[PDB]
Design a protein around this nucleic acid. Structure first.
Ligand SMILES: [Zn+2]
Ligand SMILES: [Zn+2]
Lengths: 120, 119
DNA sequence: TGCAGGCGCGCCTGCA
DNA sequence: TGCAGGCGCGCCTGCA
DNA sequence: TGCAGGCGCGCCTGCA
DNA sequence: TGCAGGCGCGCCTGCA
């Protein structure tokens, strides 16, 4: 009771506010392209055989979320799988991943379960 | 909105939100024992600077440990309820009204966030 | 309900 | 020297 | 010198 | 509907 009341008054940190901004950014795109269910299926079931969850690729490959840039597959693999993920060099797509980042296609797959972490 | 909160619950960087709950649980347990919990809720919800000092015992080095993390008690609770980007105790100055301020080295340390001003 | 295991303050080490 | 961080004994908690 | 980060126009939201 | 304001991708800049 008092603990949960006092916790509600907590000033929110920028990292949690940014994570929410990162998830809202992806959800808005997936909703528009009919891919939101697949993201929830991939995240909650950890199923590697899920479809590619794609977003359009930018000219430099970077994605901006609340004044912060990063590679989109790296942003969402750090979010749902490896918080200590340093760079794209630590990621390796599976053969089944049609839209892997490394392939530089029109769309980029951000399904965290289509990438394997390597120790570079 | 429902999908965003659902998907957010699945994130991996949850090390900091479980800690804030442990930090609040730690303070509440001490304030209930000493009859000061209502004053904390009055200070937090009303932002009233003229609230009474909300004290906890002071340790030998002045640091407080919450779930394997150490910090100065007034800094911990000012960052929690007022300034998340609060860097160190050097950015805090107690109001003159505050009898149990951190810098006073007394037996009890006041952790009412509304008895400190940011500099 | 006895008791294994969690965790904090005090003690100590180790840099800048 | 201000500060960070590791870890044990004493205190406290939650099960079979 | 590669590349992180600043910032504007275009896009979009939201009031009157 | 005239207008304000938030923010990203594309463009551009400044360091270690
Ligand atoms: Zn894929
Ligand atoms: Zn005070």
């Amino acid at each position: 009771p008092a603990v949960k009341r006092l916790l509600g008054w907590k000033q929110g940190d920028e990292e949690e506010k940014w994570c929410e901004k990162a998830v809202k950014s992806l959800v808005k795109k997936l909703k528009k392209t009919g891919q939101l269910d697949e993201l929830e299926k991939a995240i909650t079931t950890q199923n590697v055989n899920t479809k590619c969850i794609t977003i359009p690729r930018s000219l430099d490959g970077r994605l901006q979320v609340s004044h912060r840039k990063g590679l989109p597959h790296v942003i969402y693999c750090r979010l749902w799988r490896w918080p200590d993920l340093h760079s794209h060099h630590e990621l390796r797509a599976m053969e089944l991943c049609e839209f892997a980042f490394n392939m530089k296609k029109d769309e980029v797959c951000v399904n965290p379960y289509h990438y394997q972490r390597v120790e570079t």
